[PDB]
Design a protein around this ligand. Structure first.
Ligand SMILES: *[C@@H]1O[C@H](CO)[C@@H](O)[C@H](O)[C@H]1NC(C)=O
Ligand SMILES: *[C@@H]1O[C@H](CO)[C@@H](O)[C@H](O)[C@H]1NC(C)=O
Ligand SMILES: *[C@@H]1O[C@H](CO)[C@@H](O)[C@H](O)[C@H]1NC(C)=O
Ligand SMILES: *[C@@H]1O[C@H](CO)[C@@H](O)[C@H](O)[C@H]1NC(C)=O
Ligand SMILES: *[C@@H]1O[C@H](CO)[C@@H](O)[C@H](O)[C@H]1NC(C)=O
Lengths: 194, 596
């Protein structure tokens, strides 16, 4: 009874990173070696473990977070990083055990003229704690003059569009990301390797 | 939340909003310059309007942060670039009129044809057809025809357009609190907040005139030496004491004298230090030229070109399926998209131009991580200098023999040495009077110092006096000869190539000292020196984040432009020329004329 990784890795549409999607995985067999080799991923980095080691392991749940960001930002989907994405959109914990996977999605997510449907959060009054998700639309107040829900001087809407044009350099192209967390609770392991 | 902190955030907003609007304008321009059509003119106009309206809104906000309350230097520099409202201080009519004028001139320039008189439909474009005549023909009358046809049948179209361009551009400049467009252009060199590193727009004119005084003797003697050589190339046509006729100088304007090397080579029996023939025998094509320039850069520790550079650049003529502007340009579109537009031919000229244009790209790549408003050369002269530093090395016989364009037992003489210096002078020293004079004319026109019915009068007066060059045919004020040159009709500043030419030697001195080079500056080739690569890069990666006077001092130890390194590169040739000329006239009378 194999795990529905396809639904996640091969979805036609991906979330914006400000509103990243989490899929719970459970009660299924998961071959993490076939995953590592199922495509060419630009990034496949595991932190508390290794892939061959995971087929020897059982977990209560696996969580698959997915979103799109710029290439030059995939380095932020790692513990201890800082910057716009790790600070304001998606924060891995320092003690993170799990895998970060990413691949180039220029051919799916760019458009002549540019695709602007993917957003990121530009401003926040403080940093997300790990795995929090902020879909707020409040105007960011860069000062003490209050904004009252409108953009203006020292008053900025916090969500901005990536622009993905097929001709951008690699750092500016869209990359699709999947983050796998492995949860072990005082309950039966329901997702295992062979 | 200090003012500085509020401005920091505002600029954070700006950089992210700006990136796409700028990139879309770049793409629109790219289509036009690679494929001239009314539809692409309209799209370019639309994308540039969007960009300018964005800039206008953004600048008026930026000026709400008083610079007086700002200590961060690099913050102050970004808000200084938004201190003027730009091109949108012109009414909609005037702005659409100005764009029409700019597009028409650029279209006329890269699209206009003159037809042969013997063949009323064997038409020729400037590039390649006319340029080839002007680089290779040894016939007074053919060269006179191409030089006169271009200016008569195309330059005349540009005359009334250029007139209104001046009027409109000066209004734009006056609205931005400059005296005229020419003052506006000179602002590229202004530095204000930094003590002991300031530089005013008036000091540029002074430093260019003062520095030019020290170049005259070298030029006087190079002038006198080619003029004696041309006497035998064009029997009957050269006065021994006169200016050189402008159609005999080796290109359409005499901007460079390089193509006169085959007529002025000091030592002709020696191996050819002009590798054009050698690279045709070896089946080199454009790709080989650009892959070789790429090898040169990674040899000093800098990157490959990007894949997008190779897939999207235009490195050869597209053929007649498109109408393109072939003038070599290095494009930084944004978002890590870098391209060169060039109609490369298999010639040492284009070989070296390939290295120089790539040099500018290399600069663009090195400061891509700087904040948007500081993604720029320290000044326009810096940005035009990097490439030329590179070609100084790439042109040396040592380098040319190592990439296999001279025999592996090629031997260097005091004579091959003089051949090389002579050819280098034809290009580098030849262009300086040409470059100074052209901008002086434009500065004067912008300042309102030349009544319109004296434009071509004063132009040729200035040619005869500063440049030693005379028109072969009298020209009416129906002509607009300055506009027959790309940069004038494509609205680019020109003094960059003056200051650039002094910088490039100041820099080469410092790079060669880094690479531990042994003897005189013209035998230096920085290939394979990562210590030289590194010293260069640490200046490239800064962009405009430091005032150019400090950026310069950090590399060469002088906070100002300096002519001595160029003079000393050429000292060996200077003493030779002075000996060569001991029996010839040196200097020129401005009264003689090819026509009477
Ligand atoms: C995604 O689709 C391809 C093609 O059907 C398939 O071979 C691949 O294994 C899929 N990836 C995953 C992780 O299921
Ligand atoms: C040139 O531009 C036109 C639109 O003005 C376009 O339809 C055509 O495909 C372009 N040609 C090339 C080679 O890009
Ligand atoms: C543009 O600049 C001028 C002069 O600084 C200023 O008065 C004006 O308010 C700015 N904005 C607009 C839309 O003109
Ligand atoms: C200038 O500001 C930048 C941040 O914008 C800072 O990193 C840098 O150290 C500052 N230097 C000075 C002289 O203000
Ligand atoms: C060093 O330069 C020489 C030519 O001077 C060239 O033949 C050689 O391949 C270069 N070496 C490296 C490691 O680039």
């Amino acid at each position: 009874n194999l795990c529905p990784f396809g639904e996640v890795f091969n979805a036609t549409r991906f979330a914006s990173v400000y509103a990243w999607n989490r899929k719970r995985i459970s009660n299924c067999v998961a071959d993490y070696s076939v995953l590592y080799n199922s495509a060419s991923f630009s990034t496949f980095k595991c932190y508390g473990v290794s892939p061959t080691k995971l087929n020897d392991l059982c977990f209560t749940n696996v969580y698959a977070d997915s979103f799109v960001i710029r290439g030059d930002e995939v380095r932020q989907i790692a513990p201890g990083q800082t910057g716009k994405i790790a600070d304001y959109n998606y924060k891995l914990p320092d003690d993170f055990t799990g895998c970060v996977i990413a691949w180039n999605s220029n051919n799916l997510d760019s458009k002549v003229g540019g695709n602007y449907n993917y957003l990121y959060r530009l401003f926040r009054k403080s940093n997300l704690k790990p795995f929090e998700r902020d879909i707020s639309t409040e105007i960011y107040q860069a000062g003490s003059t209050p904004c009252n829900g409108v953009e203006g001087f020292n008053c900025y809407f916090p969500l901005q569009s990536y622009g993905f044009q097929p001709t951008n350099g690699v750092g500016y192209q869209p990359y699709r990301v999947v983050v796998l967390s492995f949860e072990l609770l005082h309950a039966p392991a329901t997702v295992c390797g062979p | 939340w200090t003012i500085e902190e509020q401005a920091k955030t505002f600029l954070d907003k700006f950089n992210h909003e700006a990136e796409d609007l700028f990139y879309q304008s770049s793409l629109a321009s790219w289509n036009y310059n690679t494929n001239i059509t009314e539809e692409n003119v309209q799209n370019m106009n639309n994308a540039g309007d969007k960009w300018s309206a964005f800039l206008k809104e953004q600048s008026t906000l930026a000026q709400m942060y008083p610079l007086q309350e700002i200590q961060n230097l690099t913050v102050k520099l970004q808000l200084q670039a938004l201190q003027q409202n730009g091109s949108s201080v012109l009414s909609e009519d005037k702005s659409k009129r100005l764009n029409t004028i700019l597009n028409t001139m650029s279209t006329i320039y890269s699209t206009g044809k003159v037809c042969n008189p013997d063949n009323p439909q064997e038409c020729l474009l400037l590039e390649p057809g006319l340029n080839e005549i002007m680089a290779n023909s040894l016939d007074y009358n053919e060269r006179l025809w191409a030089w006169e046809s271009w200016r008569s049948e195309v330059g005349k179209q540009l005359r009334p357009l250029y007139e209104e361009y001046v009027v409109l551009k000066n209004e734009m400049a006056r609205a931005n609190h400059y005296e005229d467009y020419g003052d506006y252009w000179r602002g590229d060199y202004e530095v204000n907040g930094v003590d002991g590193y300031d530089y005013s727009r008036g000091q540029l004119i002074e430093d260019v005139e003062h520095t030019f005084e020290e170049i005259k003797p070298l030029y006087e003697h190079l002038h006198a030496y080619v003029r004696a050589k041309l006497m035998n190339a064009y029997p009957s046509y050269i006065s021994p004491i006169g200016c050189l006729p402008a159609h005999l100088l080796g290109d359409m304007w005499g901007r460079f004298w390089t193509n006169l090397y085959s007529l002025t080579v000091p030592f002709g029996q020696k191996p050819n230090i002009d590798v054009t023939d050698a690279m045709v025998d070896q089946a080199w094509d454009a790709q080989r030229i650009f892959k070789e320039a790429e090898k040169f850069f990674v040899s000093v520790g800098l990157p490959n070109m990007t894949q997008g550079f190779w897939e999207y650049s235009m490195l050869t003529d597209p053929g007649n399926v498109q109408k393109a502007v072939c003038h070599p340009t290095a494009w930084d579109l944004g978002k890590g998209d870098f391209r060169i537009l060039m109609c490369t031919k298999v010639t040492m000229d284009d070989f070296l131009t390939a290295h120089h244009e790539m040099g500018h790209i290399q600069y663009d790549m090195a400061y891509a991580a700087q904040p948007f408003l500081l993604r720029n050369g320290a000044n326009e002269g810096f940005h035009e200098a990097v490439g030329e530093i590179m070609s100084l090395s790439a042109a040396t016989p040592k380098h040319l023999k190592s990439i296999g364009l001279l025999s592996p037992d090629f031997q260097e003489d005091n004579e091959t040495e003089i051949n090389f210096l002579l050819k280098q002078a034809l290009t580098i020293v030849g262009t300086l009077p040409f470059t100074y004079m052209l901008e002086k004319w434009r500065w004067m026109v912008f300042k309102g110092e030349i009544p319109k019915d004296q434009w071509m009068k004063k132009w040729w007066e200035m040619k005869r006096e500063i440049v030693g060059v005379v028109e072969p045919v009298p020209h009416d004020e129906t002509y607009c000869d300055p506009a027959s040159l790309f940069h004038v009709s494509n609205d680019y500043s020109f003094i960059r190539y003056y200051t650039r030419t002094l910088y490039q030697f100041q820099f080469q001195e410092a790079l060669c000292q880094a690479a531990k080079h042994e003897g005189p500056l013209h035998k230096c080739d920085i290939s394979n020196s990562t210590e030289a690569g590194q010293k260069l890069f640490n200046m490239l990666r800064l962009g405009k984040s430091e005032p150019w006077t400090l950026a310069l001092e950090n590399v060469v130890g002088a906070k100002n432009m300096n002519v001595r390194p160029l003079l000393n590169y050429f000292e060996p040739l200077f003493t030779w020329l002075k000996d060569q000329n001991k029996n010839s006239f040196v200097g020129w009378s401005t009264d003689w004329s090819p026509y009477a």
